[PDB]
Design an enzyme around this catalytic site. Sequence first.
Site, PDB file in Angstrom:
ATOM      1  N   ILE A  23       3.753  36.816  55.806  1.00  0.00           N
ATOM      2  CA  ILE A  23       2.301  36.946  54.959  1.00  0.00           C
ATOM      3  C   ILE A  23       2.345  36.677  53.816  1.00  0.00           C
ATOM      4  CG2 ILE A  23       1.189  38.233  56.828  1.00  0.00           C
ATOM      5  CD1 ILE A  23       2.033  40.355  54.698  1.00  0.00           C
ATOM      6  N   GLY A  26       7.067  35.496  47.341  1.00  0.00           N
ATOM      7  CA  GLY A  26       7.598  34.683  45.308  1.00  0.00           C
ATOM      8  C   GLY A  26       8.762  34.927  45.385  1.00  0.00           C
ATOM      9  N   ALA A  27       9.202  34.683  44.388  1.00  0.00           N
ATOM     10  CA  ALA A  27      10.978  34.808  43.528  1.00  0.00           C
ATOM     11  C   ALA A  27      11.130  35.624  44.096  1.00  0.00           C
ATOM     12  CB  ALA A  27      10.871  34.286  42.319  1.00  0.00           C
ATOM     13  N   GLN A  28      10.832  36.595  44.735  1.00  0.00           N
ATOM     14  CA  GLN A  28      11.890  37.771  44.591  1.00  0.00           C
ATOM     15  C   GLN A  28      11.823  38.256  46.184  1.00  0.00           C
ATOM     16  OE1 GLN A  28      10.343  42.272  44.582  1.00  0.00           O
ATOM     17  NE2 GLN A  28      12.378  43.309  43.517  1.00  0.00           N
ATOM     18  N   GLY A  29      11.145  37.949  46.393  1.00  0.00           N
ATOM     19  CA  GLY A  29      11.066  37.892  48.742  1.00  0.00           C
ATOM     20  C   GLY A  29      10.667  37.415  49.174  1.00  0.00           C
ATOM     21  N   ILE A  30      10.557  36.762  50.275  1.00  0.00           N
ATOM     22  CA  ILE A  30       9.522  36.653  51.696  1.00  0.00           C
ATOM     23  C   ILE A  30       9.041  37.609  52.049  1.00  0.00           C
ATOM     24  CG2 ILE A  30       9.019  35.180  54.046  1.00  0.00           C
ATOM     25  CD1 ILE A  30      12.004  34.506  51.477  1.00  0.00           C
ATOM     26  N   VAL A  31       7.837  38.310  52.392  1.00  0.00           N
ATOM     27  CA  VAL A  31       7.510  38.856  52.944  1.00  0.00           C
ATOM     28  C   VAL A  31       6.778  38.738  54.296  1.00  0.00           C
ATOM     29  CG1 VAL A  31       5.958  41.305  52.856  1.00  0.00           C
ATOM     30  CG2 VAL A  31       6.316  40.531  51.469  1.00  0.00           C
ATOM     31  N   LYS A  46       9.718  43.663  53.620  1.00  0.00           N
ATOM     32  CA  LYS A  46      10.168  41.889  52.872  1.00  0.00           C
ATOM     33  C   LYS A  46      11.059  42.159  52.397  1.00  0.00           C
ATOM     34  CE  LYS A  46       8.538  41.435  47.420  1.00  0.00           C
ATOM     35  NZ  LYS A  46       8.125  42.640  46.131  1.00  0.00           N
ATOM     36  N   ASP A 142       2.531  44.453  33.593  1.00  0.00           N
ATOM     37  CA  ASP A 142       2.962  43.712  33.985  1.00  0.00           C
ATOM     38  C   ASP A 142       1.756  43.525  34.672  1.00  0.00           C
ATOM     39  OD1 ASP A 142       2.763  40.704  33.608  1.00  0.00           O
ATOM     40  OD2 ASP A 142       4.600  40.431  35.129  1.00  0.00           O
TER      41      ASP A 142
HETATM   42  C1  LIG Z   1      -2.578  36.448  54.126  1.00  0.00           C
HETATM   43  O1  LIG Z   1      -2.177  37.073  53.111  1.00  0.00           O
HETATM   44  C2  LIG Z   1      -2.441  38.606  52.834  1.00  0.00           C
HETATM   45  C3  LIG Z   1      -1.841  39.365  51.771  1.00  0.00           C
HETATM   46  C4  LIG Z   1      -1.347  40.518  52.111  1.00  0.00           C
HETATM   47  C5  LIG Z   1      -1.372  41.444  53.298  1.00  0.00           C
HETATM   48  N1  LIG Z   1      -0.979  42.415  53.707  1.00  0.00           N
HETATM   49  C6  LIG Z   1      -0.223  43.244  52.638  1.00  0.00           C
HETATM   50  N2  LIG Z   1       0.363  43.540  52.971  1.00  0.00           N
HETATM   51  C7  LIG Z   1       1.804  44.453  52.481  1.00  0.00           C
HETATM   52  C8  LIG Z   1       2.696  43.794  51.631  1.00  0.00           C
HETATM   53  N3  LIG Z   1       3.312  44.865  51.168  1.00  0.00           N
HETATM   54  C9  LIG Z   1       3.837  43.570  50.496  1.00  0.00           C
HETATM   55  N4  LIG Z   1       5.044  42.950  49.595  1.00  0.00           N
HETATM   56  C10 LIG Z   1       5.885  44.613  49.659  1.00  0.00           C
HETATM   57  C11 LIG Z   1       6.130  44.674  48.491  1.00  0.00           C
HETATM   58  C12 LIG Z   1       7.200  46.066  48.308  1.00  0.00           C
HETATM   59  C13 LIG Z   1       8.012  46.470  49.307  1.00  0.00           C
HETATM   60  C14 LIG Z   1       8.248  45.865  50.502  1.00  0.00           C
HETATM   61  C15 LIG Z   1       6.301  44.593  50.773  1.00  0.00           C
HETATM   62  F1  LIG Z   1       6.557  44.096  51.817  1.00  0.00           F
HETATM   63  N5  LIG Z   1       3.237  42.929  50.502  1.00  0.00           N
HETATM   64  C16 LIG Z   1       3.317  40.832  49.567  1.00  0.00           C
HETATM   65  C17 LIG Z   1       2.538  39.854  50.654  1.00  0.00           C
HETATM   66  C18 LIG Z   1       2.450  39.503  49.617  1.00  0.00           C
HETATM   67  C19 LIG Z   1       1.599  39.680  49.156  1.00  0.00           C
HETATM   68  C20 LIG Z   1       2.364  40.606  48.592  1.00  0.00           C
HETATM   69  C21 LIG Z   1       2.412  43.067  51.479  1.00  0.00           C
HETATM   70  N6  LIG Z   1       1.095  42.777  51.849  1.00  0.00           N
HETATM   71  C22 LIG Z   1      -1.911  40.926  54.431  1.00  0.00           C
HETATM   72  C23 LIG Z   1      -2.110  39.413  54.607  1.00  0.00           C
END
Ligand SMILES: COc1ccc(Nc2ncc3nc(Nc4ccccc4F)n(C4CCCC4)c3n2)cc1
Length: 333
Positions: A23, A26-31, A46, A142
């Site tokens: 979903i 970024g530079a830091q991880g795939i989520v 992530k 930031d």
């Molecule tokens: C389709 O476009 C989307 C966008 C967001 C969602 N929903 C969603 N929910 C929880 C998230 N946690 C993180 N990051 C994260 C940070 C710290 C620890 C663990 C993590 F996973 N992200 C990133 C995914 C891309 C946007 C932010 C998350 N995105 C769902 C769909």
Amino acid sequence: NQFYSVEVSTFTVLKRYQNLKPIGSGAQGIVCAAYDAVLDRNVAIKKLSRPFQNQTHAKRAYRELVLMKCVNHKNIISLLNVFTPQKTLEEFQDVYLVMELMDANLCQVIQMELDHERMSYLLYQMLCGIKHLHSAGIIHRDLKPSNIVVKSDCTLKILDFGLASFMMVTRYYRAPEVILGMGYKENVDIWSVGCIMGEMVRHKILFPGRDYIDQWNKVIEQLGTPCPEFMKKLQPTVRNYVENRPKYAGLTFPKLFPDSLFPADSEHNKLKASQARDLLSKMLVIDPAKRISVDDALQHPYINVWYDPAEVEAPPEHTIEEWKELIYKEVMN
Ligand SMILES: COc1ccc(Nc2ncc3nc(Nc4ccccc4F)n(C4CCCC4)c3n2)cc1
């Protein structure tokens, strides 16, 4: 084994986590989104791939793992799980962070038309998040929409902890004092809130630029050239760069953000439009000594309809091998 691997890039995860779908990236991880069988609900996972690999990745990964435990607030990321598949410090490569799955990031929400009830709700929560951070001694510096997430019910979480330097970065929401390397205090974060708010209304980034040089120009072209007592706090090199760019009157807030941009048909919406513009004009203030504070932003009429004491007034370098071990131990808690 407790873990299993899937290509997403390879995700090697605990077996409770099913049906991974990427979903974010970024530079830091795939989520990935996933189903969590044990908790019987959806989570975001992530992967931080070898985060001790440089100073930048390492500091951020490490710092955000420590800060996790210094916060406890519904508007700030909470971790459900922290894990590594590797079993020894020597083998250690990857850290996986698990949190509640939300529906969208702020980038996405920004692109929609929102009524004032929602707009103001998003903002009240950002300010409650930031208020929480500050009370824990964390100034973020930031804050930006790609690290902020939202649910369909309009609830909001801030995902990162900001700044504390090379690698092979969106700056648009950073305060003048960050853009110009000056002192800052807690209201540095108000500026980023006003940038996100401006964007919610205008649907364009307020202050784009290739780097701080363009970005500063967009700042002054819109808000106008700052005032005397602002310069007095600039280092003499920045001061003189800043005292020598073309000057600008800067446009008033109704030019910056016209009625056209606001839900403004009914009397209710005409009144909320005026108040939203009042807050914008108070947050997007170049000089921090004249910028609104977090607590005053929370007492503003556009925001204070949500106010809740429970939500507002609540709780509270290294070599790569040194980082690998700092991060490992943190993961092992
Ligand atoms: C389709 O476009 C989307 C966008 C967001 C969602 N929903 C969603 N929910 C929880 C998230 N946690 C993180 N990051 C994260 C940070 C710290 C620890 C663990 C993590 F996973 N992200 C990133 C995914 C891309 C946007 C932010 C998350 N995105 C769902 C769909």
